[PDB]
Structures are given as structure tokens and as C-alpha cells.
Design a binder for this molecule. Sequence first.
Ligand SMILES: Fc1ccc(C2=NNC3=NCCN3C2)cc1F
Ligand SMILES: [Cl-]
Ligand SMILES: [Cl-]
Ligand SMILES: [Mg+2]
Lengths: 142, 128
Amino acid sequence: GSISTAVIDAINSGATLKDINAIPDDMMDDIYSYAYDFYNKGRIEEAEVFFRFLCIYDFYNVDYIMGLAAIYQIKEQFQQAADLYAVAFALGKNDYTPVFHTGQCQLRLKAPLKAKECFELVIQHSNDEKLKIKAQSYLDAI
Amino acid sequence: TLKDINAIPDDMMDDIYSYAYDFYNKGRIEEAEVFFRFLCIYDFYNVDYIMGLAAIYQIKEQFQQAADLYAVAFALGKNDYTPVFHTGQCQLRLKAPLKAKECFELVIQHSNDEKLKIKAQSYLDAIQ
Ligand SMILES: Fc1ccc(C2=NNC3=NCCN3C2)cc1F
Ligand SMILES: [Cl-]
Ligand SMILES: [Cl-]
Ligand SMILES: [Mg+2]
């Protein structure tokens, strides 16, 4: 998957496609928009390929990671989704949306203590009042 | 992964990790790097294996490579902010002090590791 690719790239430490500027920003932006065209039409399998392609080129991009994580959550691949949401959070320190979704995934993974920690982080640190209500509704049910 | 098919026994993998750390502690960086690369090929999803290779890259002043691995290590472990602390150090070396500040702030806001937070605060205090 995307994470294994990132680690292999790191182990081998060779020239990556991004390191050589193999695809310009404008083209990457276009491909990202195409990925969501597929996604928005329910063509989740094509969208997944396009987001995997984006994540091979530039894994450390919050927008690419969040798109792929969303697909895995929809497909009920909850551990892969949680792992990617956690990457997205590390890259995007100030957005607690990936932490909220990690909590949802942890609940489906039968890990309520991890989920509780996620939802509590949202309540204590997010400035998104609507996200906080949603996190509290999950907390109330745990 | 090779771990998924149990290609090497568990006890032998523990030995190899301990040998990797022995090389690391003795300053035998080239050998530790081989051993941590071996471990990460065997199980890319082992946070401690990733952290070891990331540490080697940081010592070698390959700061971006280290930060990239620390991001994966953080994600897999979810609740351990040690990789975030080391990323902050890497960002300082990469002349990205605002990114470093965000890393150290994240450690202090989320971590339950008091000794780690003391270290993070000492870096924050020094950031201009
Ligand atoms: F906690 C972390 C926060 C950011 C990063 C990062 N690593 N690598 C990286 N490449 C482009 C942006 N970016 C941030 C790693 C962490 F471990
Ligand atoms: Cl937020
Ligand atoms: Cl900066
Ligand atoms: Mg608040």
C-alpha cells in the first residue's frame, strides 16, 4: 500500500520521482481533480487508483492522503484508513478532522479506548465547534 | 511483509534488533544502517524498526529522510509523540523553525510522556 511504498522509498533512499520533479504541480493538481471527479460519481475503484498514484508521487501531501483515507473508510478497510488519517494529522497538525475519523475507525476496529482518546483530543484542542459536537456524540455512546 | 509469512522466527528477529541497537550504541553507524534497513524490509509496519532507521538518517544529517520516516512511525503508533519531537529537531536543522515550533507544540499538547514534554519545552523556549 501507500505506507509500504513510502517506507521502501525511504529504505532504498534512491532518487524518487518527486526528487527529480517528474510531474509538475499543475499536472498533479489536474490529476487530483480527476480523482475527485471519479470519486464524486461513485467510481471509487478508479478514484482509489488515482489517489494511490498521487500518493506514490508525493506521499507527504495532506490532500492526497485524506482522499485515499476516505476511500478506505468507505470500503470498511478501517485499519488502513486509520493509519492514513494519522499520517494526515501529523502533516496537518492543526486540523482535527483526521483525528475524528481515526476515532470512528478505531470504534469499528473494536478499540474503544483508542477511539475515546481520539474523540477527547478533538474536544480539548479543536476550534471546530461542529466537529466537537460530533466527537462528543461518539464519546457519549462509548 | 516478510513478517506476515513468519520468514524468520520471532526470537531471532529480537536478536537482530538488539544487534542493530548494539551497533548504534557503539557508533558503528554503517552497520546499524544495514541492520535497520534489513529490519524495515522484513516488517515495514514495525514502529521501533522504523524509528531506528529514522534515527540513523538523523545522525547522518539526512534530515528530510528522517522526518519522512518519523511521519510514518507516528502514524503507525498513533499515540507516541517521540517521532514528532525528533521531526521538530529535523525541522530546526532544515531551517524551518515555524514547522519545528508546531511539532514541539504538538508534543506538549498531546503527549502524556512528561520527560518527552520537558525536552520539547526546552526546544520551544529557545525558538526565536
Ligand atoms: F510529526 C511529523 C510532522 C511532519 C512530518 C513531515 N515529514 N516529511 C514531510 N515531507 C513534506 C512535509 N513533511 C512533514 C513528519 C512528522 F513525523
Ligand atoms: Cl479542527
Ligand atoms: Cl518554517
Ligand atoms: Mg477549545
